[PDB]
Each structure stands twice: as C-alpha cells, then as structure tokens.
Amino acid sequence: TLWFRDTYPFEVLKQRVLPELIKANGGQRLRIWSAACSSGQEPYSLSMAIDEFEKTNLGQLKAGVQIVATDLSGSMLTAAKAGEYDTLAMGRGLSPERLQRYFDAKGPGRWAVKPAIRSRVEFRALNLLDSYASLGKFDMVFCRNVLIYFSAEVKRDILLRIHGTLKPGGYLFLGASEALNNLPDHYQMVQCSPGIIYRAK
Amino acid sequence: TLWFRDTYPFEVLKQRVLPELIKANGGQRLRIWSAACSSGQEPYSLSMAIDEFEKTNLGQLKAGVQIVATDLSGSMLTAAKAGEYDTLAMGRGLSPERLQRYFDAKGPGRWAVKPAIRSRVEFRALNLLDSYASLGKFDMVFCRNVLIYFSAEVKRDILLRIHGTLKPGGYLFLGASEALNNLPDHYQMVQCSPGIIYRAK
Amino acid sequence: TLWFRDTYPFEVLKQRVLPELIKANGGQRLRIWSAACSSGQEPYSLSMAIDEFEKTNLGQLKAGVQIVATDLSGSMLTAAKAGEYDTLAMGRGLSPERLQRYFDAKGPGRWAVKPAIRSRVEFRALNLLDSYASLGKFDMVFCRNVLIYFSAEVKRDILLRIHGTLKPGGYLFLGASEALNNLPDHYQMVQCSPGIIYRAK
Amino acid sequence: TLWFRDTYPFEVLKQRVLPELIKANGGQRLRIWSAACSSGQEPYSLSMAIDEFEKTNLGQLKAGVQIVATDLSGSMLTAAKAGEYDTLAMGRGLSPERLQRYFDAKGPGRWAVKPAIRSRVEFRALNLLDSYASLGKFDMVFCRNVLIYFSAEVKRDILLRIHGTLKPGGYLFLGASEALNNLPDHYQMVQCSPGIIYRAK
Ligand SMILES: Nc1ncnc2c1ncn2[C@@H]1O[C@H](CSCC[C@H](N)C(=O)O)[C@@H](O)[C@H]1O
Ligand SMILES: Nc1ncnc2c1ncn2[C@@H]1O[C@H](CSCC[C@H](N)C(=O)O)[C@@H](O)[C@H]1O
Ligand SMILES: Nc1ncnc2c1ncn2[C@@H]1O[C@H](CSCC[C@H](N)C(=O)O)[C@@H](O)[C@H]1O
Ligand SMILES: Nc1ncnc2c1ncn2[C@@H]1O[C@H](CSCC[C@H](N)C(=O)O)[C@@H](O)[C@H]1O
C-alpha cells in the first residue's frame, strides 16, 4: 500500500463526487467505507482529501464526513489505529506539502497523522466474507486491490453485498486495474478522465 | 433457513396481504402460523415485518398479531425461542436498518432478537403429520420448504389439513419453488410480481 | 401401530435372526434400533420378544440386548416413554399370556408395561432427516411403515444412512408391504416365508 | 465444518499416513498444520485420531504430536480455542464412543473437548495470504475446503508455499472434492481408496 494510491481517486473525490452528493443532501453528513484498509494509508489519505476539500469550500460540508476503515483484526489493523509510520512508509506517495501540513514528527524516523486527520477515521475489525450489516449505509465505498485475491464467485458475492451498503447513486472505487464483472444491473461504470468509478443503481 | 428468505413474501405481506386481512376482519387481532420454523429465522422475520407495517400504518392493526411457530421440537426448537444467533446465522439476509432496529449485540459473535420482537412469537411442538386442531384458526400460514420431503399423497393431505386451520380468505405461503397442484376447490393462486401465494377459498 | 404388528416379523427375529447373530458374536451385547417407534408398541414388543427368547434359550444371550427407540419429540414419544396404554390400545394384537406376563394394571382401563420390559428400551428424540452418527452401530434396525410418508429421494437417503448404522451382515426390517429396490450395493433381500428382510452388505 | 468430516481422511491418517511417517522419521515429534480450522472440529478430530492411534500403537510415537490450528481472527477462531459445542454441533459426525471418551458434559446442551485432547492443539490467527515462515515445518498439512475461496493464481501460490512448510515426503490433505493440477514438480498424488492425498516431492 501507499499514500494517495493512483492519485486520481482522491482528485475525483474532491472535484466530482463530493460536490454531487453535497448538492443532493444539503451538505449533511457523508459516510465513507474504506474496505481492507491495511496499515491505514488509504483511509488517512481519504481524511486528508476531505480536509483539503473542506478548507477550499467554506463551508459546504455542514456535518463533516465519517470514514469507517475495516480489515482483519491483528497487529496490522492495530498499527493503523495508532496512526504512526516509519520513514520508508512516509516517502511513498506523500507530497512534502502534505507531510508538513498533516503529520507530526515524534520521534526519529517516526511520523503520526495529525489529530484532525486521525479523528475522521474509526477502525473496525471486519472479515469481508462476513456480513456488512453492522456497518450501516455509505455514500462512497473504497474497495481497492483486495477483490483480486478471490474467486470470481466470491468476488461477485462481495460486490453484491457491498451494493447493499451503498446508498442509491453512491459510488464504489475499485483498484485501478480491477474490473467489475457480471453485475450490469447493480453498477454503472462512470468515466472520470482519468479513472473509473461505479455508481450504485 | 435464513432471514427474510426470498425477500418477496415479506414485502407482499406488508403491501398486499395485511391491508386485505385488516379490511376483511375490521383491523382486529390476526394470527400467523409459521410451520416448520427451523431455528426461528422465519417467525422472527414475520414479527419484524409486522413491526414495520405497524409503523407505516399506525392504528390499522387494532390488537396486534400473534405468531405461532412449530417444528419437530428438539434442540433446534429450543434454540429458536432463545433468540440467539451466532456470526453465521446473522450472515445473510439482514439489512443494516433491520439489524440495528430489531437485534441486540450481545457478546462477540452473538446477537439476540429484541424482546419486543420476540414477544409476538409463541413456540410449540407439533408434527406436520399430526392433527392441527389444537392450533386454532389462522389468518396466515407459513409452510415453506418442508413439503418437498414428503410423498405427493402426504403433501396433498398436509395442504388439505392446513386449509382446515385457515380462516376463510386466509393466506398460505409456500416455498418459492414449491407448487400447490391438485387442490382447486381449496386454494386460489394469487400472483404478486414477484412470487405466488395462495388464498383459502 | 399395534402390538406385535404382522406377527411373523417377531417370530423371524426369535427363530432366525437372533440365533444367527448370537452364534457369530458369541452371545455378546446386541443393539436394535426401532426407528419411528410411535406410541411404543413396536419397541416394547421387541423387548417382550427378547424376553421370550431369553427364557427359551438359557443362556445364549450373555450380555443382554439394547433397544434404542426413536420418533419425533412430542406426545406420542412421551406416551411411549411412560409405557401406559388404555383398553383400546391393549385389545389389538396382544395375546392373553403376554398381557398377564408383561403388563401391570394401572387403574380402570389403563395398563403399563412391566419395568423388566421397559428397562431394555431407551427413547431418544430423533428426526429421520438428521444425522445418525450419535446412535452408534446396530445388529438390527426396525424401520416399519414410516418410509411411505417421504419422497423417493428422501426414502433412499434415509435407507442409505441407515445402512451406515448397521453392522455388516445385520438385518433391516421394513413394513409388511414395503420394499426397497434401488440400493443393490447396500442391501440383499432375504426371503423369510412369510415376509422379507434386508441384509446389510 | 463438522466432526471427522468425510470420515476416511482420519482413517487414512491412522492406518497409512502415521505408520509411514513414523518409519520415515524414527518416531520423533510429529507436527500437523490444520489450516482454516474454523470452529475447531477438524483439529480436535485430528487430536482424537492421534489418541486413538496411540491407544492401539503402544507408544510408537516417541515425543508426541503437535497440532497447529490456524484461521482468520474472529468469533469462530475464538470459539475454537474454547473448545465448547452445543447439541446441534455435537449431533453431526460424532460416534457415542468418541463423545464419551473425549468430551465433558457442561451446561444443558453443552459439551467441551476434554483437556487431554485440547492440549495438543495450538491456535494461531493467520491469513493464508500471509507468510508461513513463522509456522516451522510440518509432517502433515490439512488444508480442506478453503482453497475454493481464492483465485486460481492465489490457490497455486498458497499450495506452493504450503510445500515450503512440509517436510520432504510429508502429506497434504485437501477437501473431499478438491484437487491440485498444476504443481507437477512439488506434489505427487497418492490414491487411498477412497479419496486422495498429496505427498510433498
Ligand atoms: N478476507 C479478508 N477480509 C478483509 N480484508 C482482507 C481479507 N483478505 C485480505 N484482506 C486485506 O486486503 C488488503 C489488500 S492491500 C490493499 C490496501 C488498500 N486497499 C490499497 O489499495 O492500497 C490487505 O491488507 C489484507 O489484509
Ligand atoms: N414432519 C415434520 N413436522 C414439523 N416440522 C418438520 C417436519 N419434517 C421436517 N420439519 C422441519 O422443516 C424444516 C424445513 S427447513 C425450512 C425452514 C423454514 N420454513 C424456511 O423456509 O426457511 C426443518 O428444519 C425440519 O425441522
Ligand atoms: N421424519 C420422521 N422422523 C422420525 N419419525 C417419523 C418421521 N416422520 C414420521 N415419523 C413417525 O413414524 C411413525 C409411523 S407409525 C409406525 C409405527 C411402527 N413402526 C409400526 O410399524 O407400527 C409415526 O409415529 C411418526 O411419528
Ligand atoms: N484467507 C484466509 N486465510 C485463512 N483462512 C481462511 C481464509 N479465507 C477463508 N478462511 C477460512 O476457511 C474456512 C473454510 S470452512 C472449512 C473448515 C474445515 N477445514 C473443514 O474442512 O471442515 C472458514 O472457516 C474460513 O474462515
């Protein structure tokens, strides 16, 4: 994993998706699910992106954005919760501007997300083969580079149940080279130039 | 068995069956029979569906609904009235709104149906090959995915004796793939889009 | 159901099956499964037959016989456990000698099987559709007039799994008008004149 | 999952695999990996089968057997460590002899695997996608009914890295309906009649 992986998912979030969802709900609270969050780079990247949007658009989001980040419980999810990273992890995909604006040095070779970035993310233990019903409803779901490991039938079952967590017209973000197969009545492919997102029908 | 199996019967119940039965009986007390209740998923799904109709149609049900769930009494019957279900039993069929409104999160990997939903259900021991005279009269009978195990002659006799327990105009719900042939003087087919239910003539 | 139903199955047990099974195992413990025992007439008849064999052939049974009686849990299995019967049930198929030797009067119009006969019979709640592993191994299985109620697919699966409970060379007794005809690798029909039994291959 | 699933893999272990490996290592310590142990039925069945082997082969195993049971972290892995099972779980695949010899009755409808059987099993949380280096070397690996969840490329990688955990000539047990077909340099299929296992080349 790395920070702001592929660049354009987070630009699309700020430029395209957020203004559309805010216009419909009157700026009320939005919820984002970061599925298989690994060591936390993706959910914290989402948190920084929302912070950047909120600062440039005073004040379109009236209630903020909740990020729910999930993975299997253990030491990897535990470190994500701690929000600390070593130098090697911090040099992959993070501009120097974001490093100084959003992280605190500890600590020789240790950096931690700033409290405003940390507070948007709640980490929960969740197996993707289990039920998603405890997670609630989401305006956006990020499920990137995890579906690749499963069989075609299990991948379809996960995508179908992800659809049950999305509000209608919400968006699913997959990995850059991941296709969404055999659910033509559940997801609409949307071109972002660059990038592809999938609207929940 | 699973929660809200096949989706359509519990929506057809709230949108077509209940308004008709209320009209036919003046909104008075209704009785539902869940035959072959298995581990309790079906009768509790009925109770939840009754709760949902009540909130959207306040005052229409004047005295509530009583649910009688029967099966071959045994460890399975005992676990049904306990109302406890592990991670696998809660895995499929429960929307996020239903899991939060009708269940209690117990310990790790254990959930319990709320007592307000459990109250509507009463469990008894009853073999489908025995008499039903002790059960009383029902406006609705759920007898799903149990008739497949018997001979055509036993299946017809069960469906005929179920007619004896149904109030005139009462409704019978079978499995989504089960047929009700060979009984034209007793059951009227009601296509619902999607699914098929049967009215006692 | 009735006492010593069809008569000759219990004579074949005493004259033909017991001497063969006792000779091979040296008179050690025998186990008999009475599947679908109903109100108990069949297992108690078997226990009476064993007692008649034990007092006729002293002392070829050196370890006694265990009878496991199963049916669906309810007022017909609970009636069998008590071993009490009314005049109507006592008047069908019971000789006067067996009535005097094996029953106690229990008030007007009530009779009870003697404790010496009931002691051999253990009653267990068991659906024929569930697994049989907890039952152990049997030298004989009586499964009479219950398979008729099921579909062809369920009947064959029950018969196949019954074979898994039988010791090789053990015997299966069906109802007087029942047969099996699609398990050639598992059972061998044995003419008894009159009636038939099935040897477990 | 269930106790002694498919029956014959555990008989093959006692009759063929254990004696061959004992001669293949001189009776020293054996290690078994139960991968994807789920609620623990499989590793506890293995520990029971080893006990049954030890009661027949008078201490032909010099320094005992270690069983390592792994699965994803969650409620099911935590239930396995406890070793307690309800009536429904105890009623599938367990003979009356094994119930008495290897379980202690607890609460009403509750049984627990005896400490003599649990002590041989160590439970660890492990994603099969992660490295196996910390597990050491095994004479036998049970990886049953889990490979079907993954892509063809992940399945081959998992089986390839399982070979890295196996001692030369060690045995791999898959599910009854599973096979590997693209690792000709690493695995040799062994026919057992019935069923199949694989030997590490
Ligand atoms: N069954 C499962 N349930 C939940 N998470 C799983 C899983 N199997 C694998 N994963 C997780 O999926 C992650 C894929 S790494 C991808 C991280 C992030 N989404 C990104 O795009 O950079 C791993 O961290 C792994 O822990
Ligand atoms: N003779 C009989 N009398 C009562 N119940 C029976 C029965 N034979 C089988 N059953 C029950 O019927 C159930 C079928 S599973 C069906 C459960 C539920 N009706 C659903 O559709 O989801 C089994 O659990 C079994 O316990
Ligand atoms: N699924 C099932 N599992 C176990 N018993 C069942 C069953 N379905 C029906 N039965 C039982 O089978 C019995 C048939 S009456 C037969 C009784 C006795 N074997 C005789 O020949 O006279 C009934 O008492 C009924 O309770
Ligand atoms: N990525 C993964 N790593 C480890 N275990 C996994 C896994 N994905 C699924 N599993 C586990 O694989 C199990 C399959 S059920 C199989 C249990 C047992 N081996 C038997 O044959 O009966 C499930 O318990 C599931 O938790």
UniProtKB/Swiss-Prot annotation, chains A, B, C, D:
GO biological process, one term: methylation
All copies of domain CheR-type methyltransferase, residue ranges: 1-201
UniProt-recorded Gene Ontology molecular function terms: protein methyltransferase activity; protein-glutamate O-methyltransferase activity
Disulfide bond entries: none
EC number per UniProt: 2.1.1.80
Domain of life of the organism encoding this protein: Bacteria
Keyword field: Methyltransferase, S-adenosyl-L-methionine, Transferase
Annotated positions binding S-adenosyl-L-methionine: T1, R5, E42, D71, N127, L128, R144, N145
Catalytic activity line of the entry: L-glutamyl-[protein] + S-adenosyl-L-methionine = [protein]-L-glutamate 5-O-methyl ester + S-adenosyl-L-homocysteine
Function: Methylation of the membrane-bound methyl-accepting chemotaxis proteins (MCP) to form gamma-glutamyl methyl ester residues in MCP.
Protein name as annotated: Chemotaxis protein methyltransferase 1
Organism annotation: Pseudomonas aeruginosa (strain ATCC 15692 / DSM 22644 / CIP 104116 / JCM 14847 / LMG 12228 / 1C / PRS 101 / PAO1)
Origin organism lineage: Bacteria, Pseudomonadati, Pseudomonadota, Gammaproteobacteria, Pseudomonadales
